[PDB]
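Hi L.,

As promised, Alpha-mannosidase 2:
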Amino acid sequence: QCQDVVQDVPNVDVQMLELYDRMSFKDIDGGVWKQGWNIKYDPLKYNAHHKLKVFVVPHSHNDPGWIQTFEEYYQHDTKHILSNALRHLHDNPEMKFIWAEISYFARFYHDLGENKKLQMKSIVKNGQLEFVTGGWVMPDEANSHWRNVLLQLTEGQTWLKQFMNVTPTASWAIAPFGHSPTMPYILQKSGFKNMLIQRTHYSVKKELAQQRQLEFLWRQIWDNKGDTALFTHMMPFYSYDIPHTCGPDPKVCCQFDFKRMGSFGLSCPWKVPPRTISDQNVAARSDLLVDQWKKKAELYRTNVLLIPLGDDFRFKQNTEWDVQRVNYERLFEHINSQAHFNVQAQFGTLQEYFDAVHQAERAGQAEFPTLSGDFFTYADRSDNYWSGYYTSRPYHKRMDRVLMHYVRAAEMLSAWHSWDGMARIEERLEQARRELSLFQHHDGITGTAKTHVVVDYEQRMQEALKACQMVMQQSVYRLLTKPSIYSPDFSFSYFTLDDSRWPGSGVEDSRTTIILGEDILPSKHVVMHNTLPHWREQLVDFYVSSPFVSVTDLANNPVEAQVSPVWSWHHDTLTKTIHPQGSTTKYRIIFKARVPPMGLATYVLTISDSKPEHTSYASNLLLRKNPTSLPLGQYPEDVKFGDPREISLRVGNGPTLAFSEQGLLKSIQLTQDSPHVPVHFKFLKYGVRSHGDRSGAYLFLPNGPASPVELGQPVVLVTKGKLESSVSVGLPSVVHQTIMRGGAPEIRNLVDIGSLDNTEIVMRLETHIDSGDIFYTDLNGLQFIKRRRLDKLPLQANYYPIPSGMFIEDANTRLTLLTGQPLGGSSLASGELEIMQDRRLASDDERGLGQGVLDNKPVLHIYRLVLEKVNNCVRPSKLHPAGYLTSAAHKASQSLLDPLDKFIFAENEWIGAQGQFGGDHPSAREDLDVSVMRRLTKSSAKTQRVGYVLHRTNLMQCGTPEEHTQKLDVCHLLPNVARCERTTLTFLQNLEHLDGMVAPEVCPMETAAYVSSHS
Ligand SMILES: OC[C@H]1O[C@H](OC[C@H]2O[C@H](OC[C@H]3OC(O)[C@@H](O)[C@@H](O[C@H]4O[C@H](CO)[C@@H](O)[C@H](O)[C@@H]4O)[C@@H]3O)[C@@H](O)[C@@H](O[C@H]3O[C@H](CO)[C@@H](O)[C@H](O)[C@@H]3O)[C@@H]2O)[C@@H](O)[C@@H](O)[C@@H]1O
Ligand SMILES: *[C@@H]1O[C@H](CO)[C@@H](O)[C@H](O)[C@H]1NC(C)=O
Ligand SMILES: [Zn+2]
């Protein structure tokens, strides 16, 4: 039944990796079409029985934050655009307009009076104003997680269904910097039939244009059958503005942007202005315009032509609506009445274009090619590759993944119950979803906005995190308190969240210490949540005010624990060293939590007057010349000192790691007998060019290969414990930490680029794996795509997004690096992986931001590093464009993106506390996730509805029997099920009524949505 995603290489007309291997990428001057050629056409192609049908589609690109904040743009620009669109479309029944960004549209519509809301609904209902995509934003496609692309699509489309009674089936993505197949994947599973893209490499546009392959059926790289295919239109020219949308010659097209005559403060760079259309010049003007159109039409297969008419924050002033509409109407009247042109031109919408194209297709006038692959890394000209934004503003890139998980956890924890309106649960969740959705914008997560705009996004995300926390902690109190005792105050904090990795040690002192003492409080309840649908163990840590603390479960069973010091690193501006200081009053307690699928587990921390039986203490070794003492208060083991030296550590039965005298990994030995496999971490720096084009927020233009960071003799701290050991080193700009808990290590970098201008800090792994020119990186946390390093392209072109992981492998060995944040990276030589940590750039890179990147702040980046033998794995053939994780690497990714949540009871005594929730939840196969659980109804609905998105990844078969799990039927997770339906991923359309009210599990690489109804 399920397609095999490993063993069958899809047959497609265009496969982008194969295309890349054969293309030359020469940047030659093509004439007026600078990156193309002089298009020729036969005037006799079109005649009375075969006309060229031209749709001119007015639009206005509205950024939800970029050079101004969302609200600043709304007040200065977008409210006027929407108000004038309402008036002008109402008064001119033939005029049309498309709208993409529902964040703005919702902000506007809710401020309208009823009379105007009704006028607005009427111009939508009658097809004059058409929503395209309908997401909250037009998201970045490189750094965004697929879960958040879905979240923002759903937020916008749910608003549209509710208020406008429409669901777009055509997507418009004119602005993201390069394009991902994650988009057609999600859109096709959300009812879409068509999509449009624009920012692809100029060489790719030229190559596909030559073959008339700019319209294609875009399927996923593993899809043999083609059921994922989505019809895609790629625009052919350098920009989506008017000069680059009428045809190949911008000097001509610019004369048809009637906003550029002077009074609006705009002009044509090509030095020939628009002229008002009159009876005396309409023939000559129409000659010029129709020639452009016929040239553009040569690049496509049907007699239906799309002509976008818009640009950034256009259609603001009434006078602008008039100047565009009246002049185009005069052109249409002339062109359409002159039989010799054999053109019928008119204003249209995006859907009208695609409907006409498919009519031509069904008439047998065209067949379209199939395509798989992606469209990264984008270059718009010369060697200007937009790989800088894979890293820019990495603090907020990390924040995105933290909030991603908090939103999921809050929606899931609160979904189990119906909530009174006074609890404000729906209100807080809507705020959290909207702020996370806003940040998916192609100037949000990308790090390409002005400083004060980044601050705005950060503030919004902080508010969203507080909202998630409130919802989460109220939900835990309800789920774990005896119902007849449960007595909620919906404003009260029953628990506080404890997060060990955000903002992170050295970033913010934000974690509460659990305060215990014989004269204040003997013990404290803590609760862990596991959002994943399988039983999970994970080490968890809390700060406590005594080293003498023991852990129990709620059956009072002792739990083995480890206590370690609290270490903070300081750039000592007196001694000019970076070194750690230990607390003499706060300590870390660490223990293994075991939590049910989608469940909760309670533990108790209790103080005693001396070392407890079931708690051990880590040893600590500070390696440096010229040590001074490090007292640790009551901590029972004295810190040891030594000169820098190589060291080796092993936790449990796990790998043995060896480190250099500078505290950096040099080798990994998987088992007792096995080789010490060379795996070396190194930090390097890229610079900026001193002549020619400068790196900025968008572009990465290095002045050659990276140079090693000079390390000096750094201070190394080794902590050795039964449950957790670590090696931490204070390097220039980076406190680098390797943590061992018995499996693949965790890596944490506290990155503070300080005042190092024009520097990019990279973390590289050096191995002897014979990977050649091949490596793999993920797309949106959804799939791994094969990359080939191309020495015919510059270094920055071989950088790709690393939104969640990357790997290299040979016949026998693979190294996978999983990330807790999207960053840029590559494999620039056989056996290497590298990933950029931060970048600080003094110059603007001429893309409109008008500033460099000088607002850096300390960030804690997190990773897992998985070395594995892969000789026994069933891998795709050499020609397959995909790769797949192993079980260990997938689990390591989940440990970073969706860790256990930790809650500390806030008061002294928790009356009616219970030990566990979800112990009867099915424990699903490891490749299955419940990506979303969301209650879709408020408490006043007679029939309650709960939505689930179920995703199954595909993990490699490597010989592990891995057995007995339970079937997960999401429709039976809540009692009193009356109906189970399969829906689109946005939950907005029912696709199948399910027998037995049973939701089937999905196939590998598939994602399905289900809604259960409850009486
Ligand atoms: O590029 C990614 C970006 O795409 C869209 O926005 C693109 C904008 O492109 C054009 O503006 C580029 C110029 O903008 C500035 O204001 C300046 O920063 C300028 O640089 C000069 O000055 C710099 C000072 O630091 C200097 O460093 C540099 O060397 C330059 O000398 C930029 O060159 C425009 O197309 C702009 O659109 C406005 O202007 C149009 C032309 O007049 C109008 O037709 C239009 O209505 C609008 O008023 C674009 O906004 C967005 O998609 C964005 O999301 C994305 O990040
Ligand atoms: C919404 O659209 C449908 C047609 O798609 C129509 O039948 C219905 O009356 C419209 N108004 C609603 C649903 O309120
Ligand atoms: Zn934009």
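The domain at 494-618+899-920 is CATH 2.60.40.1180 (Immunoglobulin-like).

Thanks again for sending the construct details.

K.
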